[PDB]
Amino acid sequence: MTEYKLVVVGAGDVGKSALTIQLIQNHFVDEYDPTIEDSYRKQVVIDGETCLLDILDTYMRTGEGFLCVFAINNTKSFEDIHHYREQIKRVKDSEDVPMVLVGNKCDLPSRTVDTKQAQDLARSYGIPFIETSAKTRQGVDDAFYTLVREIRKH
Ligand SMILES: Nc1nc2c(ncn2[C@@H]2O[C@H](COP(=O)(O)OP(=O)(O)NP(=O)(O)O)[C@@H](O)[C@H]2O)c(=O)[nH]1
Ligand SMILES: [Mg+2]
């Protein structure tokens, strides 16, 4: 079937790796042990088109579409997403590159990125915003299938 090369980007401990795992083994890890594989893959169905997801946990010119991740519990990571999109679309000679902004760590009650704040950042960058929590799985599948449609409708 069709295969889609997604890479997860973002700042430190935002939960890039942690997002992946939950997507692949439907489980929430509390600490990765310094990089093992970094490049998993999963068979899924999206609207009948069953297809494969090659997730690269962070060369990435290969990437087809990108999830940009910031944790909502610290605003530095959320400021750094400009630096990422600006670099995603750098090594890609196109301001058009399938992309999803995801805010992680929703069970955390001391949030410091307003849900509006992302929401507006997203629309200004043209992309969609999803909120996730690898610990409670909420919208972890959601944020990935979104990216896959942003690649197919591209
Ligand atoms: N409460 C909560 N903690 C989360 C959530 N997602 C990730 N974390 C935690 O945040 C920490 C960072 O996870 P990790 O996947 O290593 O983040 P990372 O982006 O891979 N960090 P690094 O850039 O060092 O590889 C982990 O210990 C994980 O338990 C979430 O939704 N809720
Ligand atoms: Mg990681």
UniProtKB/Swiss-Prot annotation:
* Subunit structure of this chain's protein: Interacts with PHLPP. Interacts (active GTP-bound form preferentially) with RGS14. Interacts (when farnesylated) with PDE6D; this promotes dissociation from the cell membrane. Interacts with SOS1. Interacts (when farnesylated) with GPR31. Interacts with RAP1GDS1. Interacts (active GTP-bound form) with both SHOC2 and PP1c (all isoforms) to form a tertiary complex; SHOC2 and PP1c preferably bind M-Ras/MRAS, but they also bind K-Ras/KRAS, N-Ras/NRAS and H-Ras/HRAS. Interacts (GTP-bound form) with MAPKAP1/SIN1; inhibiting K-Ras/KRAS activity.
Q: Where along this sequence does the record place binding of GTP?
A: 10-18, 29-35, 104-107
Q: Could you tell me which Pfam families the record lists for this protein?
A: Ras (PF00071)
| Protein name per UniProt | GTPase KRas
Task: Tell me the organism.
Answer: Homo sapiens
State which Enzyme Commission number(s) the record gives.
3.6.5.2
Q: Which GO terms describe its molecular function?
A: G protein activity; GDP binding; GMP binding; GTP binding; GTPase activity; identical protein binding; LRR domain binding; protein-containing complex binding
Q: What does this protein do?
A: Ras proteins bind GDP/GTP and possess intrinsic GTPase activity. Plays an important role in the regulation of cell proliferation. Plays a role in promoting oncogenic events by inducing transcriptional silencing of tumor suppressor genes (TSGs) in colorectal cancer (CRC) cells in a ZNF304-dependent manner.
According to the UniProt record, what happens if one changes residue 134 to T?
A: In OES; somatic mutation; also found in colorectal cancer samples
Recorded superkingdom: Eukaryota
**Belongs to which family?**
Belongs to the small GTPase superfamily. Ras family.
Which parts of the sequence carry N-acetylmethionine? Answer: 1
Gene Ontology BP, a term: Rac protein signal transduction
The protein's PTM annotation reads: Acetylation at Lys-92 prevents interaction with guanine nucleotide exchange factors (GEFs). Lysine-depalmitoylation by SIRT2 promotes its localization to endomembranes in endocytic pathways.
Note how its activity is modulated. Alternates between an inactive form bound to GDP and an active form bound to GTP. Activated by a guanine nucleotide-exchange factor (GEF) and inactivated by a GTPase-activating protein (GAP). Interaction with SOS1 promotes exchange of bound GDP to GTP.
Q: Looking at the keywords, is Ubl conjugation present?
A: yes
Bilayer topology term = Lipid-anchor
Assigned keywords, A-Z: Acetylation, Cardiomyopathy, Cell membrane, Cytoplasm, Deafness, Disease variant, Ectodermal dysplasia, Glycoprotein, GTP-binding, Hydrolase, Intellectual disability, Isopeptide bond, Lipoprotein, Membrane, Methylation, Nucleotide-binding, Palmitate, Prenylation, Proto-oncogene, Ubl conjugation
UniProt xrefs under SMART domains: RAB, RAN, RAS, RHO
- Catalyses which reaction(s): GTP + H2O = GDP + phosphate + H(+)
Please list the residues that carry the modification N6-acetyllysine. 92
List residues modified as N-acetylthreonine: 2
Q: What class of enzyme is it?
A: hydrolase
| Effect recorded for residue 12 to D | In GASC, JMML and SFM; somatic mutation; also found in pancreatic carcinoma and lung carcinoma; also found in metastatic colorectal cancer
* Transferase among keywords: no
